[PDB]
Design a binder for this molecule. Structure first.
Ligand code: DHT
Ligand code: 4HY
Lengths: 248, 10
């Protein structure tokens, strides 16, 4: 009862990407904006994460680690949710001043990826996900990707993850009645969570390549963005950091 | 400077 009150109170607010919606849609313009929105959205995730119960009792090193590995999956999941309640999953609502339409998806040279994220949005509708179920799932996403060897203090991490997995169970169970719909529901939500990883990986690779040849494509990468994508992302695409799926 | 964000004060 108290847990849900927290996630709702610490839930970040609207964030603008600062895109010049008066300039012809181009690869450089759109991407440069997305990177900026990523920088702005990142600052809020850090604050949001700190407010997360138990997050503070995590080794400072792991705190910055988990954040640098799941920031992508978290932002996408939230974007899809916004796209679902803002445009009915019609388009991708990255930001109030950065709404992606069919045309912009192609102009971004990542139409296939946008198509996958859009499905995620539609998923929120088909499964009738509730704001409460969403809030918790997003929180669980924070502890859904860690290095293979483990964290500085894997002990506390597993304990926290276990508690959030239980919180998700509570939100569901504390509304149903029969022991049948409770399982099937937990199954669907856990499935929805894993479907985010594949999408995040494709975005990890795309942003990676973009960074490499960002000098010739005229795409600006903020400080934090370029540092995480050049140090953290590689570990993910190399196998160092692997997501934590519920199902095989 | 993510650490800078990690340990701000207010
Ligand atoms: C995380 C962001 C920005 C925040 C958001 O709402 C989700 C969205 C998903 C695609 C990302 C984008 C940030 C900039 C990236 C990483 C581009 O370089 C390629 C993929 C873009
Ligand atoms: O009982 C409930 O529902 C509320 C609840 C929610 C959580 I997430 C939880 O997990 C930890 C674990 C370590 C730690 O330092 C902290 I702060 C919290 C516990 I314990 C209880």
């Amino acid at each position: 009862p108290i847990f849900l009150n927290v996630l709702e109170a610490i839930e970040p607010g609207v964030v603008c990407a600062g895109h010049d919606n008066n300039q012809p849609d181009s690869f450089a313009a759109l991407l440069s904006s997305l990177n900026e929105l990523g920088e702005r959205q990142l600052v809020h995730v850090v604050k949001w994460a700190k407010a997360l119960p138990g997050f503070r009792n995590l080794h400072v090193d792991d705190q910055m680690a988990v954040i640098q590995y799941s920031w992508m999956g978290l932002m996408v999941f939230a974007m899809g949710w916004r796209s679902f309640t803002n445009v009915n999953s019609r388009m991708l609502y990255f930001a109030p001043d950065l709404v992606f339409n069919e045309y912009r998806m192609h102009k971004s040279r990542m139409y296939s990826q946008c198509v996958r994220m859009r499905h995620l949005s539609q998923e929120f509708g088909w499964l009738q996900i509730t704001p409460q179920e969403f809030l918790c799932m997003k929180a669980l996403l924070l502890f859904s990707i860690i290095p293979v060897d483990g964290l500085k203090n894997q002990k506390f991490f597993d304990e926290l993850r276990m508690n959030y997995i239980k919180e998700l169970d509570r939100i569901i169970a504390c509304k149903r009645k029969n022991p049948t719909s409770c399982s099937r529901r937990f199954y669907q939500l856990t499935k929805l969570l894993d479907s985010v990883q594949p999408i995040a990986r494709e975005l990890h690779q795309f942003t990676f390549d973009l960074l490499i040849k960002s000098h010739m494509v005229s795409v600006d990468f903020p400080e934090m963005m370029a540092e995480i994508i050049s140090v953290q992302v590689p570990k993910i695409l190399s196998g160092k950091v692997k997501p934590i799926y519920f199902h095989t | 400077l993510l650490r800078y964000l990690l340990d701000k004060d207010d």
